[PDB]
């Protein structure tokens, strides 16, 4: 199923290099979570193991290497050499059906290595799943609705990027959808998170640092300084490039309260990924003004389960206050008609350590939605108490 080593999200490489540079001895364990608790059989698990083993044959091609050098210059030559000689190691991954009959998958090993498993594994599970249940896309609808969406975004000049790899119906569907959008969205299409398809269709790659980056810092450095040190380390790695920051890892209120003038001035944008967008806009604009930073020159990239229409609505809310762009996912890569619905799956960093000899530290995420928290319950409580939540 996975044919290219570049068939993954941009953030996997940018965060991967950040780990390789600053935390080359760190270890991490990623855990697959089917939030719908669907029942899975051992034969499906075996299909997954086969795909995971197949990935060991992937290797960077000469054209892909040249593409990385030309289009992703923020990735230094040393990292390109690493990717050029990189080979997925299947034994870092363990697949099984748990006691409750649920699909369980864990990738454990050096963090800079295992972080690369996330997107490919989720995309593989998603594609394998639809094949398994015999679902097929209604290409007529794919062609039609994608064109309509593209024309709509173009008409409203809604800058957007394609962020739907992890839950795509299939590589084929994401590939064609990207092709259609490129053809009808005009300048509204900023780019795609899928590095492989950006290469194939001549588009810009698009993405931001992920939650795992902040979460790693929270587990190692503690909750009070998590956001701050994560941003300082990101700057050390990219010197100002990739200047977008996620604010809801430990709640946006905590982020804003500790957002320094230096970082507010240096980063060009914030990313909204949970909670009500209108409420997020108010908090952002208010904090920027408190810091005497002009919100009008800043951008907010909205990416919380968006639809083209919802993007247009948020766009109105931002008019005259702060700039806006969008990250649209599953609505584009998994809308094949026939009642087919996207899987509700994720694979998150569950725990980590600074070096082999360090103890394991659980990672948590709070988000801006009350009650919606992820991670070891005991650790979640500690984070809330530590942050005064």
Q: How far apart are CA 163 and CA 325, in angstroms?
A: 12
Q: What angle do CA 182, 184, 190 make, to 5 degrees?
A: 45
Which residues fall within 8 angstroms of residue 34, CB to CB, at 6 or more apart? 40, 102, 103, 343, 344, 345
Identify the residue whose tokens are 């064609």: 176
Q: Reported resolution in A?
A: 2.2
Q: How far apart are CA 34 and CA 128, in angstroms?
A: 15
Residue 126, both tokens:
């998603």
Q: How far apart are CA 21 and CA 302, in angstroms?
A: 29
Q: How far apart are CA 311 and CA 317, in angstroms?
A: 10
Q: How far apart are CA 145 and CA 332, in angstroms?
A: 9
Q: Please list the alpha-helical segments (H only) found in 3-160.
A: 10-22, 42-54, 62-71, 77-85, 111-114, 118-132, 139-155
Is residue 137 within 8 Å of residue 305, measured between CB atoms? no
Domains of the chain and any CATH numbers: 1-389 (3.20.140.10)
Choose among 195, 193, 251, 200: nearest CA to 226.
251
HSE value, Cβ hemisphere, 13 Å, CA-based, for 89: 12
Identify the residue whose tokens are 């904090």: 287
Q: How far is CA 208 from CA 161, 212, 246, 326, in A?
A: 11, 12, 8, 12
- DSSP letters, 248-278, are -TT-HHHHHHH--HHHHHH--EEEE-SS-HH
Residue 230, both tokens:
């994560």
Q: How far apart are CA 289 and CA 247, in angstroms?
A: 17
Q: How far apart are CA 293 and CA 299, in angstroms?
A: 12
- DSSP letters, 308-364, are HHHHHHHHHHHTTTSEEEEEE-HHHHS--STT-----EEEEEEEEESSTTSPPEE--
Tell me how far the alpha carbon of residue 260 is from its chain's centroid. 25
Q: What are phi and psi of 113, to 5 degrees?
A: -85, -60
- Largest separation between any pair of C-alpha atoms in the chain: 59
Cβ burial, residue 218 (10 Å; 0-12/13-18/19+): buried
Residue 76, both tokens:
């230094």
Helix then strand then coil, % of the chain, to nearest 5 = 50, 15, 35
Is residue 365 within 8 Å of residue 348, measured between CB atoms? yes
HSE value, Cβ hemisphere, 13 Å, CA-based, for 371: 0
Element (H, E) at 283: helix 277-290
């Amino acid at each position: 199923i996975i044919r290219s080593i570049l068939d993954t999200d941009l953030y996997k490489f940018t965060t991967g290099y950040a780990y390789a540079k600053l935390f080359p001895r760190a270890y991490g364990e990623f855990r697959f979570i089917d939030r719908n608790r669907q029942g899975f059989t051992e034969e499906f698990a075996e299909l997954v193991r086969g795909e995971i083993r197949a990935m060991a044959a992937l290797s960077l091609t000469r054209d892909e290497k040249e593409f990385l050098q030309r289009e992703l210059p923020y990735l230094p030559p040393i990292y390109i050499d690493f990717l050029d000689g990189f080979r997925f190691d299947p034994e870092e991954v363990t697949v099984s059906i748990d006691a409750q009959g649920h699909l369980d998958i864990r990738a454990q090993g050096l963090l800079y290595r295992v972080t690369l498993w996330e997107t490919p594994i989720l995309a593989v599970i998603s594609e394998l799943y639809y094949r398994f249940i015999g679902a097929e896309p209604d290409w007529k609808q794919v062609e039609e609705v994608t064109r309509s969406k593209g024309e709509l975004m173009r008409e409203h000049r809604a800058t957007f990027s394609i962020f739907g790899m992890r839950r795509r119906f299939s590589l084929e569907v994401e590939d064609r959808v990207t092709d259609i959008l490129k053809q009808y969205a005009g300048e509204s299409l900023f780019g795609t998170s899928n590095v492989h398809l950006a290469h194939k269709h001549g588009l810009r790659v698009s993405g931001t640092h992920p939650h795992e980056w902040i979460q790693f810092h929270g587990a190692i450095y503690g909750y009070k300084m998590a956001n701050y040190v994560a941003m300082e380390d990101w700057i050390n790695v990219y010197d100002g490039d990739l200047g977008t920051v996620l604010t809801d890892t430990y709640t946006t209120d905590v982020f804003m309260r500790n957002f320094s003038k230096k970082h507010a001035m240096l980063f060009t944008s914030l990313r909204h990924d949970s909670g009500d967008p209108e409420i997020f806009i108010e908090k952002a604009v208010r904090r920027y003004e408190e810091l005497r930073v002009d919100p009008k020159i800043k951008y907010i990239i909205f990416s919380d389960s968006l639809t083209p229409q919802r993007a247009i609505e948020i766009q109105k809310l931002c008019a005259g206050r702060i700039k806006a762009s969008f990250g649209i996912g599953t609505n584009l890569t998994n809308d094949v008609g026939g009642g087919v619905e996207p899987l509700n799956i994720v694979m998150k960093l569950w725990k980590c350590k600074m070096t082999a000899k360090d103890d394991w530290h659980y990672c948590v995420k709070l988000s801006d939605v009350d009650g919606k928290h992820t991670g070891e319950p005991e650790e979640i409580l500690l984070a809330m108490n530590t942050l005064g939540i």
